[PDB]
Amino acid sequence: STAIVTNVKHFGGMGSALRLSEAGHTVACHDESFKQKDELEAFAETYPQLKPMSEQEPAELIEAVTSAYGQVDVLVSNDIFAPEFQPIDKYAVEDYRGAVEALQIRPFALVNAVASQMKKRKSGHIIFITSATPFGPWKELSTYTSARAGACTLANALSKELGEYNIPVFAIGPNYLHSEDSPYFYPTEPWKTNPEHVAHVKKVTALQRLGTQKELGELVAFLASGSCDYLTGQVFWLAGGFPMIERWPGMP
Amino acid sequence: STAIVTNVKHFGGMGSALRLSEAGHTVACHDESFKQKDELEAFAETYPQLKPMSEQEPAELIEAVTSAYGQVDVLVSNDIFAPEFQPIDKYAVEDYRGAVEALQIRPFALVNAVASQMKKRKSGHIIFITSATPFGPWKELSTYTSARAGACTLANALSKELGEYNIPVFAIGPNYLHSEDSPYFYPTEPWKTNPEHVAHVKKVTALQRLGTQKELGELVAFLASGSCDYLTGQVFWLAGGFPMIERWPGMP
Amino acid sequence: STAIVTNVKHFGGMGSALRLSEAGHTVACHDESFKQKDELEAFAETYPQLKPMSEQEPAELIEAVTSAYGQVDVLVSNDIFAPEFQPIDKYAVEDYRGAVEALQIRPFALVNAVASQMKKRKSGHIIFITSATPFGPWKELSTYTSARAGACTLANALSKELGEYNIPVFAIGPNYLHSEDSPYFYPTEPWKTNPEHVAHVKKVTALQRLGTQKELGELVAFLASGSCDYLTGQVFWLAGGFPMIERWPGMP
Amino acid sequence: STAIVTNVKHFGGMGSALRLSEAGHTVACHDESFKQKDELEAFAETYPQLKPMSEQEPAELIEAVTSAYGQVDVLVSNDIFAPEFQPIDKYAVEDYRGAVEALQIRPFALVNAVASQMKKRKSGHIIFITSATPFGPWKELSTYTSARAGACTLANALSKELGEYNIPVFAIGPNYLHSEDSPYFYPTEPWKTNPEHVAHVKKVTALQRLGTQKELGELVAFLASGSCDYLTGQVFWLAGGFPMIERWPGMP
Numbered sequence A, B, C, D: 001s002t003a004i005v006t007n008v009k010h011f012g013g014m015g016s017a018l019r020l021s022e023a024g025h026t027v028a029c030h031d032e033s034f035k036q037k038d039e040l041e042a043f044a045e046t047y048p049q050l051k052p053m054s055e056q057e058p059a060e061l062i063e064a065v066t067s068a069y070g071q072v073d074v075l076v077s078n079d080i081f082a083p084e085f086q087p088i089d090k091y092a093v094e095d096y097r098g099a100v101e102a103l104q105i106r107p108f109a110l111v112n113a114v115a116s117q118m119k120k121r122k123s124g125h126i127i128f129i130t131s132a133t134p135f136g137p138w139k140e141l142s143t144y145t146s147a148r149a150g151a152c153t154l155a156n157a158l159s160k161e162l163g164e165y166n167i168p169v170f171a172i173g174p175n176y177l178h179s180e181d182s183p184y185f186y187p188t189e190p191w192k193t194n195p196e197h198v199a200h201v202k203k204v205t206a207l208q209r210l211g212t213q214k215e216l217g218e219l220v221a222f223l224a225s226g227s228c229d230y231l232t233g234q235v236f237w238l239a240g241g242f243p244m245i246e247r248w249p250g251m252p
């Protein structure tokens, strides 16, 4: 079928697009950099099994993919934001508005733009790549964490109405997911190269390692395949057993 | 001490302000109508124990209450929004922005404005009145429901950073909470007077009745009293046992 | 690899064994009926790809499969119980003991018996088929629902310690999952044949249909394939969007 | 009214019993040690405001309290168990049976014995003192943790059926709750006196301190007063913001 993966160069983007592509789907890919022809052309040459698009806005993008390939069967809203850790009083309200715009308004805008066509033919799959931080919040990241929570619930809520139209909706919330060259959350440097970071991951996750782009891709492809639509409304915690809670003194 | 209750005329506003005042607290009250001298004076006459403020914006309000009464010890962010039920594709993206602005950005801005004074003296209580809807989403209310979830997580996340400063943070999520004359969610008319509505409440809640402002007020006053700070981070489900789940055919 | 699926004739048993066998695994199956020679042989003739075992107890079952096929790589504890709907005071305390023994003690015993061999070679997958009822309890099913909750948490807790040994642990909680000829919860008759039952399912689930054994098996096979171990600790709500909550009067 | 607090010398026992008595309630207390006249009379002399009972079994206790003090209006099931920490394969299945018997079967049996009388009057309150561990499992404590989860769900489930009879049901899940002289979970020695332990608590809790019996007592009395029945079904996380999650390397 035809799928859309946003911010393809970051977070869960490459893992999702590459695996969906290998499953035989036509993967239209969005990314802020594709605004420039040079950047879109470079990506296209590197990944001929992918279809990079230049469109940036929700409605614009859904329409271009629909016109180019016929329709949008799968939506993978891989949302990202660059937050700063900050005490609640040191943030600017604008800082929270920005987090909400990127992690809640954006996914909502994409579904708002594609829902009608999916509902008319009674088929489609919606997947939000959110975060697991709501399940185990760190101190001083209130804007990002709360925003991601809104996104998770958005997915769960949407599943309730779209189910009638045979449209499953899921939210995959990762943490400690290797992002390779992307700074979006866990790049190879320093997460696989620095001793302190390696030891941190080994302590905080049950599997004692970062999650792989492949694991994420497999999950995305599995859900988009229509192999298990009954999981609609599910919020997945792709966090490898995180969080590992500090035990009493004397316990290793 | 000194407390602030926003949108006092609606939702959990009156129950909160009334019980807090009966507790002996100085209660400064905010409300959109207080922009009108007439409305402010009339309120002050009916509830002489309460101190209505004309200030509307977060920073403005915290400053006004601080100058007038010395400091803000308790913040009750009683947030409201009037959403429409709509299939995802029928909403305007602006409809989600409005919901998020009123239910997430506002409480965030109020804490952002008062946190520094609380942290300096290492004392204060923060209470968000959110919603139990995220716990049991209805079909077609994705904007309001997801926004409320962000607010619940905001509170929990904040409890993590403010705990070091001895500042408890709670979120009270009601549903089917009687609002008396306020149209915000459950006014006396028609919820206590129309058969179909009375019957609906009886079916969906375990206690088979609306919750009372008195009950909400007792909880707010209890948490603000400093009698049980150890519940910091709690999301309270003030919904009378909702949701009651439809059982199999033939079962009573 | 070698998998074990318990109570194979009921609940999530057939979907799990069938799809696991299709994935190329050797599937040893347990069932109370296999105690009888006639039953075991009739099953082996009908499903020649499956390996019915006569063993009934945890330790002997794990030992027999290990001796016959070498080792137990995957454990699918498909637990069942036949509860009665009763007001708390009409139950016998023994009724709860029986529910806990069947839904909590059994899976714990199976893991207790196989854990050491999986830990030694640092490989294996543990999957509990539990229930979604804890997520949305009905009245008068306190014994079954609470017990199932104990099982979900058991899986999650186990993921924390077994992760260090590369052993993912999952809990699949279904509801409204078609069980075909098995009375364990949703047999074809009357769930797909009687108007009121069909209409009931269309009302309380988002997808407005029963889940299929195929969907359950696909999930079980996906998880056992080692394609997404990073989901360890996950409790899956295989309930098609259930529960759908009754909305305000006037809303369809 | 008349309240029953079990295992009064341990866990949330004294805090609950003492505050309930200060509130004016007649508080019948149960404890395994009260089987000895010596221990019972000694307790009675020290706390003339409490009424220790010798009865050990549920049915016997409810009848004894009903006969001596008219009826049972409030049940505080303060359940305890002394678990060992161990990898799943090192436990004895009997170890899990003991945990479930003490933490799940016991509270169930007590409600099973007093429910009929409360339903008849259509009044009463049920409070289970469980645990917050299910919310943040430590590895190697799978028996205790999962059993506690079962008890939490048992409460929420019962609220669904008992609400129709105006009987609120709650579950208070503590962690890091100071237990003073009782070894049940957090005694003064060493939690308030040994550096390594004091520091551990400082690290894992948001408020950076142990919870006080007074706090637990206030919550119990508040809920038992009928001041806020609309919270029925609630699972309270009385853990001071626990768990605090370890942050990235370099972060303070």
Ligand SMILES: [N-]=[N+]=NC[C@H](O)c1ccc([N+](=O)[O-])cc1
Pocket: A083, A130, A131, A132, A133, A141, A144, A174, A175, A176, A177, A178, A185, A186
């Ligand atoms: N996979 N993964 N990681 C995503 C996670 O939501 C996240 C964790 C930390 C931060 N951060 O900024 O510290 C951002 C996102």
Ligand SMILES: [N-]=[N+]=NC[C@H](O)c1ccc([N+](=O)[O-])cc1
Pocket: B083, B130, B131, B132, B133, B144, B174, B175, B176, B177, B178, B184, B185, B186, C248
């Ligand atoms: N108590 N109470 N009500 C608050 C709840 O969040 C809510 C429920 C329904 C609606 N609504 O618009 O139908 C709005 C808010």
Ligand SMILES: [N-]=[N+]=NC[C@H](O)c1ccc([N+](=O)[O-])cc1
Pocket: C083, C130, C131, C132, C133, C144, C174, C175, C176, C177, C178, C185, C186
């Ligand atoms: N699939 N599926 N359903 C299993 C579910 O746990 C269940 C639902 C109802 C009952 N029951 O007895 O009514 C038992 C189990």
Ligand SMILES: [N-]=[N+]=NC[C@H](O)c1ccc([N+](=O)[O-])cc1
Pocket: A248, D083, D130, D131, D132, D133, D174, D175, D176, D177, D178, D184, D185, D186
């Ligand atoms: N308050 N409090 N503690 C109760 C909690 O469930 C618990 C935590 C740890 C242990 N333990 O044995 O380590 C037992 C119980």
